[PDB]
Amino acid sequence: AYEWGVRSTRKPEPRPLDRVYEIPGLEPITYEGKKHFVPWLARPIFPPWERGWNDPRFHRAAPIHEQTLYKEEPCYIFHQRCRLLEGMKQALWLTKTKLIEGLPKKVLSLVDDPANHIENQEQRVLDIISHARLWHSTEDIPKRETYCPLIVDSLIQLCKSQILKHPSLARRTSAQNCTLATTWNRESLLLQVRGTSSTILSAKDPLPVIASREEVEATRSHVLETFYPISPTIDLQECHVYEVKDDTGFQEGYPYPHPHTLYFLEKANLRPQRFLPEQLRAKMLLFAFANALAQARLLYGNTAKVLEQPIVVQSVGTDGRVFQFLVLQLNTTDLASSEGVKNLVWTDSDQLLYRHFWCRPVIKKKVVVEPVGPVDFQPETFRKFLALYLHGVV
Amino acid sequence: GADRMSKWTSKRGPRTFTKSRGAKKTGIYTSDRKFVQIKEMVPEFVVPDLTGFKLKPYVNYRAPAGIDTPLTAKALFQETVAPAIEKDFKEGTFDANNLEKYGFEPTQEGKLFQLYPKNFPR
C-alpha cells in the first residue's frame, strides 16, 4: 500500500517536550513572563484561548459529527456538475422511468401545420445564429460564455412573438437561475437533487396529458435495466449532513404554479468543463423529474401513490449549437419499489441547429472558399424548438 | 546604482508595491476585494459652541503672569480628596474599604476613558 503525500511535504511533528516537565514535583521556569521567545528557557505550555465573544470575520465551524443536522444515514445528492458514468441508463433507474425515442406525436404535429409557421422563419433564425456568434460583441470571436445564453434567449424571444396569433401566450412568465430540489428513496437508497435550472418558463394551466391511462398501465411489463457491477450511486455526492427539502422552483402562492419548460445551458468555454451529450440528457431527466415530483408532493401531499392526474414537464438542453429536447410525464410517486407503474420520458437527441459557423472567410490562394455565415443550417431543429413552446396552447 | 539614501515610499517600486503615508485605517477589506467602511473607526471631532466665549488667542501685556508651579499628584490630592477625608476623620465615618467614596477607582476597566493603558487619543 502506497501512502500518498511525501513526508518532506507534511507538516513536521512537534518538538519533544522539555525534560524538565518529565520530572515530577518540579515547576519549570519558562519565558512566559518575558512575553517573548528566548532560546535558553523552557517552552511555556499555554491553555487554550477563548476570546469571550464571537467575531464573524474569524468564525470557525464545528466538526461534521457535531452539526445539528448530522445524520448517520447517507444522503446522495445530485447537482449540476455531477456526471453519471452510465449516462441515460443510470438516470432511468433512479427516476423509475421508461424511455420512448422521439417526441410525442401531439407535439410534433403542432408545427407540421403551416398556420403555426412564423413569417420569414428561416431568415430570422439565420440572423439570430449570425447575431449570436458574430455581431453581438465588439470582439472578433465571442466565447461560449456569451453566445449559448444569447442563442437560447434570442430564440425564446422569437417563439414568444406568436402572441399576435395566440393571445393565450400572455398567461406565462419566466425566471432565471431558479432552485429546484426533491427528496425520494430508491431501493433503500436516499436520493436528493440540488441544482439550479437556468431559466424556467411557467404557465397558468397544466400541460395536457401526453400518454393515456392504458399506456401507463402497460409500462408494468417493462423492467428497469441494471448495470452491474457499477452502482447507481456512482458520481453522486455522499452527504451525511443534510435537510429534507422539496422546492418547486418558486414559493407558495405564485400565480403561475404550472411549469411549462426548463432550459439548460452549457456556457463553459473549455471542453472538459462541458457535459457530453449522454451526460447532458441524464442531467436533464433528474432536474426535470425533480420539479415534477416537488409539485406532486405540494398538491397531493407527501403520500406515495399512483397519480390520478399525470404531470408533464418539458426540458430543452443545448450547448449553443447542438440541441437536445426532452418531454417527461410523471405517472407515479411510489418510487421506493423498482416494479410497478413507471414514468414515461420522450427524448429527441442530437438536434443540430447548424453544423459550423465561420466568422472570418476561408481564403485559399486568393479565393473565398467559405463565406462568413452558418454552414448547413437546419430549419427542422427550430421547428421542434417551436413545437414544445406552442404545446399547451395550440 | 539604486539610491540608498532616499526614503522608501510607495511612489517608488513597481505597481504591486504599495504602503501608506501614515493615514489611519477607517475600514475593513472583506472577501472578493470589497471595502467596507466602519463608522466607529472614523474619528469624530467634538467641537464646542463658542458663543459667549470671553477668551481670545492673544492676551493683554498689562495682565501679570503668575509663578509657574507644575501640578503634582500630591497637590491635586490635597485640594480634592484630603478635605473630605479630614472632615470624615473628625466625624469618624471613614474606612479603608470605601476609598471609592472619595473617588478612588480600583481598576480602570469599565471606564470609557481608561487612564492606563490609554484608550483615548488627544
Binding site: - | 546604482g1 539604486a2 540608498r4 539614501m5 517608488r12 517600486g13 513597481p14 508595491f17
Partner: protein, 46 residues
Amino acid sequence: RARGNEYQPSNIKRKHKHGWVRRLSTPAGVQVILRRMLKGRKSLSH
C-alpha cells in the same frame, strides 16, 4: 558585444538580495549589519 550595462535595475530583485529582512535572515548577514553600525554608516542596507 559592448559591456558596461550589467546593472539591470529591479526594486524587487534589489530588496530581496540586499534588503533589511534578507540581511537579518542569517547570523552571517546580521554580522554584516553589526559591522556597519560600528563604522557609522548612513545606510545599513537597502
